[PDB]
Design a protein around this ligand. Sequence first.
Ligand SMILES: CCCCc1ccc(S(=O)(=O)Nc2ccc(NC(=O)CCC(=O)Nc3ccc(NS(=O)(=O)c4ccc(CCCC)cc4)c(C(=O)O)c3)cc2C(=O)O)cc1
Ligand SMILES: Nc1ncnc2c1ncn2[C@@H]1O[C@H](COP(=O)(O)OP(=O)(O)NP(=O)(O)O)[C@@H](O)[C@H]1O
Ligand SMILES: Nc1ncnc2c1ncn2[C@@H]1O[C@H](COP(=O)(O)OP(=O)(O)NP(=O)(O)O)[C@@H](O)[C@H]1O
Ligand SMILES: [Mg+2]
Ligand SMILES: [Mg+2]
Lengths: 569, 569
Amino acid sequence: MNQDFKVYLRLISYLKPYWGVALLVLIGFGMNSATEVSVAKLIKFIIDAIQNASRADLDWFPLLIILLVFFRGLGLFMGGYYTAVISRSLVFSIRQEVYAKLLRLPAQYYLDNSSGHITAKIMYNVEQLTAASSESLKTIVRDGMITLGLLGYLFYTNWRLTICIMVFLPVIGILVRKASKRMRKLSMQVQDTMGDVNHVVQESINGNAVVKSFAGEESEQERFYKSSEENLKRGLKMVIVQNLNSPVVQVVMACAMALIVWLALRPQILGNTTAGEFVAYITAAGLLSKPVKNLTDVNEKLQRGLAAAHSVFELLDLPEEQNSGELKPQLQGAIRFDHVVLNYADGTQAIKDFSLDIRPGETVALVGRSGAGKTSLVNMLVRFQEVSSGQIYLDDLPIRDIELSSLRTQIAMVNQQVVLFNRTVRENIAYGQLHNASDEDVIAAAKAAYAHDFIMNLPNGYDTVLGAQGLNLSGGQRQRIAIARAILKNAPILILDEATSALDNESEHFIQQAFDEAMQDRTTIVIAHRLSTIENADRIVVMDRGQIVEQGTHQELLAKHGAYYQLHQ
Amino acid sequence: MNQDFKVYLRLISYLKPYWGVALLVLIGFGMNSATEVSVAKLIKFIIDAIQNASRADLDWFPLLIILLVFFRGLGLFMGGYYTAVISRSLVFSIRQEVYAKLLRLPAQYYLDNSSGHITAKIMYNVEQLTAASSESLKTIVRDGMITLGLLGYLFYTNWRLTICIMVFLPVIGILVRKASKRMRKLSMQVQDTMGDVNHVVQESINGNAVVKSFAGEESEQERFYKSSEENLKRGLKMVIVQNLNSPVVQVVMACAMALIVWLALRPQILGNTTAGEFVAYITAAGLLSKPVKNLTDVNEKLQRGLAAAHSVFELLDLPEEQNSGELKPQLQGAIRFDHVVLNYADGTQAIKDFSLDIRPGETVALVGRSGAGKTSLVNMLVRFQEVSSGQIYLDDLPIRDIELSSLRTQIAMVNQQVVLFNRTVRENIAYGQLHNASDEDVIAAAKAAYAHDFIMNLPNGYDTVLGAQGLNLSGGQRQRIAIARAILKNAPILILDEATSALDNESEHFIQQAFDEAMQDRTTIVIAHRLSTIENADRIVVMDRGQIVEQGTHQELLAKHGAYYQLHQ
Ligand SMILES: CCCCc1ccc(S(=O)(=O)Nc2ccc(NC(=O)CCC(=O)Nc3ccc(NS(=O)(=O)c4ccc(CCCC)cc4)c(C(=O)O)c3)cc2C(=O)O)cc1
Ligand SMILES: Nc1ncnc2c1ncn2[C@@H]1O[C@H](COP(=O)(O)OP(=O)(O)NP(=O)(O)O)[C@@H](O)[C@H]1O
Ligand SMILES: Nc1ncnc2c1ncn2[C@@H]1O[C@H](COP(=O)(O)OP(=O)(O)NP(=O)(O)O)[C@@H](O)[C@H]1O
Ligand SMILES: [Mg+2]
Ligand SMILES: [Mg+2]
C-alpha cells in the first residue's frame, strides 16, 4: 500500500531539469498566497479606516484594488503557466519513453496483448497522467500555499484560538484518507474498463469483414455496452465519493469554526479592534474554505493519475527483447542449427533437437505439413522467438552475440501473412532501414518483383497511398510489394515464407526466374508447398513436428522412396 | 462560425429524459448561490451586531456557521452529483450511438481510415466530450448562478453603483470572445494531432514484424515525436491564452471596482451603515471575483468539448452502408450478374460489363491473373462493394432489395486474407450469427475442416485463447479455422477465396474431399490457382481485367486451345 511513495519519488527523477521553472511557480503561487492573506488585511484596514476615522487612508483603497489584483494576476500567471510547462513537458518525455519501451517489447507481447489494450496504455493512461498532473500540481501548490499563508496569518492574529483548529485536523485527516483509498481502487477499475472498451473497438475495426459477413454487429454492440456501462457505473461511484467527501470536511470545519467563535464570543470581546480584528479573523477563516474544498476535490484527479503512473511504470518495467552485441556483416551467410529446441510461452514444443548446417549461397527448401515448425524455425533466425535450448551460429558466432539491429538489417524476410502500412507504395517498399533509398532504387525493386507494371496502373503510381493493410491491392499484388521490399533490402540471408502462395502462373514464373538471378552468393531459405519451386533447391529438408524426417537434393529424396517421394502423389 | 449554436441545440435533444434531474441541479446550485449571497449578508450582520451593540444577536452566529455550511454542502452535492449523472449518462448514450454508426460504415471507410484515426474518434474525442461537458456544465451552472445572485444582491444594495458595472461589461465581453475563438482553433488542432499520435502508435502495433525485421524503430520514434511534439506545442499555446485571459479580465474588473469605490468615497459616506452596508458591498463584489475567474478558466475546457462534439456529430452524419429490404432465404442460390460494372472510390474499374448466370447447387470456379477482379466480384455478392452500373439478381431479386443482414447471414465467406479475433478457438468458429451454436456444433465444424486434431493438441483445446490475429496458430491452421467458421454457417451460397493457399497436400486432400460432400444443393464460388481444385468445377470462368475471356467445363476449355489450355503450361 506504501507503493505510492515509490511512484512519487520515481516521478520526481523526471523534474530534475525543471528546478529553475519550479521556483518560478513558488514565486508566482507565493505572491498569490500573499494576495489572499492581503484580502483579510485589507478588510481590517477598510474597517479600521472607517472606525478610527481616516478618510486620508481610504483615498488609497482605489489604487490598492488595481494593485492587489494586478500583482495577483502577474503571480497567478507565473505560477499557472510554468506549472503547465513542467507538467505537460514531463509527460511528453514519458510518452516518448513509453513508446520507445513498446518498440523494444518482444513478438509474444504483441501476440498476447491486443492493439486496444496496448493503445490504452500509451494513449488513455498517458493522457490521464497529463490531465491529473497538470491540474493536481497546480491546485496542490496554489491552494496548498494559500492554506499555509492563512494558517500562518491566523496564528499571528490569534494563536490561542488557531491552536484549537489543530485538534480538529486528525478528524479531517481520517476523513480524507478513507475517501482517498476508496477512490484509488476505483481509479484502477476506471482505467482497466477503459482499456477493455479500447480492446472491443480496436477488434471490431480489425475484423470488420467477419463482423459484416457473419453479422456480428449486435454481439459487438453488446460487449461494447457491457464494458462501456461498467466504466460508467464506476466513474459515477467515484464522483459520489468525491462530491460527498468535500462537504463533510467543510461541515467538520464549520464545527471547529463555531467552537472557536463561541470562545471568541465570551464576555471579554472589548480587547480586539471590535470589528477590525474580529472580522479579519473570520474573513481569513472563510478565505480558507474555498482553497480547502479545492484540495479535497483534487483527490479524485490525484487518485486517477497515480493509478495511471503505476500503469506507466509497470509498462516501462516489463521484460523486453534482450539485446547485447557485435556488428558482424553475416558475410555470405553460413547458418548452423545445433540441437535447437523452441518452446513457446504456452509450453508448445514447435522445434525438437533440430540440427542443420547451411553453407553460404545455398538455397535450402523447408517442406512439411502444417505444424512442422517451418515458420517457427525461420522466425528464430531474426530473433522473433528466442532459442530455448541449443544454439544458432551465424558464421560460427552464437546468434545472441550479434547486436539485434545488426542481425535484422542483414536478414531479408518475406513473412507468410504479408504486412503493409497505410503509406504510399514507395514508402512501403523503402521502409525502415531502406528509408534512404532513392526513387530509382524503389522502381528497380518493384521491377525485380512483377510489381512495376501494376503500380503504374494504380491511381497514383508509386504515390498511391495504400489502405489499412494494403487491402486496396489484390492478394498477389500485396505479396509482390513485400517481395519488392525484401529485394530492395538485398541482404546476405533471404527468407521466403510462402512468398508465392497468392501469385498467378505468370507472376510465379517471372519472380522464380528473377530469384535464380538472386542467388548472388546469397543464402536463401524457401518455405514452399508448390513442389515445383522446391525442386531446384540445393538442399530439401522434410520436417515433421519440429524434427527432420529426410534431407537432400530433388533426385536423392525421390530415389529414397520416403516422405518426399510420397509427397509427389 | 455560427455552427456552434447548431451543435449546442443538437446536444440539448439528448437531455430530454433528464428534465427531472435538471431542476435538481438548479435547486442545488440555487441554494449554493443563496449561500454565497448569504456570506455578504452575514458579514453585514456580524458588523451591525458589533456596531449597534447586539450580543444577543451574536449568540446565534455559531449556530448560523454549522447551518450555512450544512445547507451549502446539501445543495452543492445535489447540484454537483446530478450534473455528473446527466453529463456522464448523456455521453454514454453518445458513445453507444457513435459505436453503432461505426459498425454501419462501409468497407471503403475501414480501408481509407486507419484504426488509430477511427479509435481517436470513439475514444479520445468521446472522452474529451465527457470531461469538458461534466466540468463546464458544473462550473457554468454553479458559478453562473452565484454571479447572478451577487449581481442581484448588489442591485438591491445599491443599484446606482451596480449600474456603472454594466458599462464595463462590453470590455470583458470583447476580451472573452477574442480568447474563446482563438482557443477553439487550437482545440481543433489539439484533437487532430492526437488522432495522428493514435495513428502512428496503432500502425506500429500492427506492423511490429516489419518494424522489427526492417529495423524501423528509429523512424517510428521520429514520426511519434513529430506528432507528439506538435500536440504539445499546441496545448501549451492554448494554456498561455487561457492563463493570460482570466487575469486581464480580473484587472478590467478591478478598474470597474476602483471607479465604483472612488464614487462611494465621495464626501457623503455618512448615509449607509458606515462599515456594515459598505463592507457588505465590497464583500459581495469580492465573492464575485473567484466564480468569474472560474467562468473564464472553463472557456479552454468548453472550446475542447465543442471541437469534440463537432467531430462526433460529423462522424454520426457520414454516409453509411445503404440498407432497405426483404427477408428472402436465398433458397438454393441462383446468381445472375447482368452487365455489372465495379468502380472503386479511386476511379479504378475492377469489373467491366460482367454478365454470368449461376444455377442453384453449382460449383463455379473463378480463374485468371492477379488483377482479374475475382475478389472484387465475389465481394459484391455480400455488398462489401456496391454495384456501380448493372445488376446482381439473387433468385431473380435485385441484390439491394434484400435486407443487408438477411443477405450476409445467408452467404458464407472464406476471405483471401483470413481474419481472426483475440478470443478462444470456439468463439472464433461460433462468431456473430453463429454465437448460439452449441459446443457439439463447434466440434462438428472443426472436424469437417481438418481443424479438430490440431485444436486438440493446442494448450487449451477449443478454449485456447487465440492471439492478436490468431498468429499463435500456423498458416494452414488459421486457414482451417476460417473454413470451420464458414462450414458451421452451412449457408445456401458458399464463397472460397483462396481458401487452400496455406494448406499442405494432406489437408488440401481431406478438405477438398469434405467439400464434395458440401455440394448439398449448395451453390459455391471457388477462387483457386491450383488447377487441380478448379478441375472438378461445374463451370470455369476465365477472367481478365474485369471481363470474361472463356467459360465452360474442364474438358470444353482444354479443347478450346485458348487461355485455359495455355494456363495448363
Ligand atoms: C476555519 C475552518 C472553518 C472555515 C469557515 C470559516 C467561516 C465560516 S462562516 O460560516 O463564517 N462562512 C464564511 C465566512 C467568510 C467568508 N469569506 C469572507 O469573509 C471573505 C469574502 C470576501 O470579501 N472576499 C474578497 C473580498 C475582496 C477581495 N478583493 S478586493 O477587495 O481587492 C476587490 C477586488 C475586486 C472586486 C470586484 C471587481 C469587479 C467589480 C471586489 C473586491 C477579494 C479578492 O480579490 O479575492 C476577496 C466565507 C464564508 C463561507 O462560508 O463561504 C465557516 C467556515
Ligand atoms: N506463438 C505461438 N504460440 C504457440 N504455439 C505456436 C505459436 N506459433 C506457432 N505455434 C504452433 O507451433 C506449431 C508449428 O508452428 P509453425 O511454425 O507456424 O508451422 P508451419 O510449419 O509454418 N505450418 P504452416 O505455415 O501452416 O504450413 C503449430 O502447431 C502452431 O500452432
Ligand atoms: N479497394 C480497392 N480500391 C481500389 N482498387 C482496388 C481495390 N480493391 C482492389 N482493387 C484493384 O482492383 C484490381 C482487381 O482486384 P482484385 O479483385 O482483388 O483481384 P483478384 O482477381 O482477386 N487478384 P488476386 O487475388 O491477387 O489473384 C486490382 O488491380 C486491385 O488493385
Ligand atoms: Mg508457416
Ligand atoms: Mg483475390
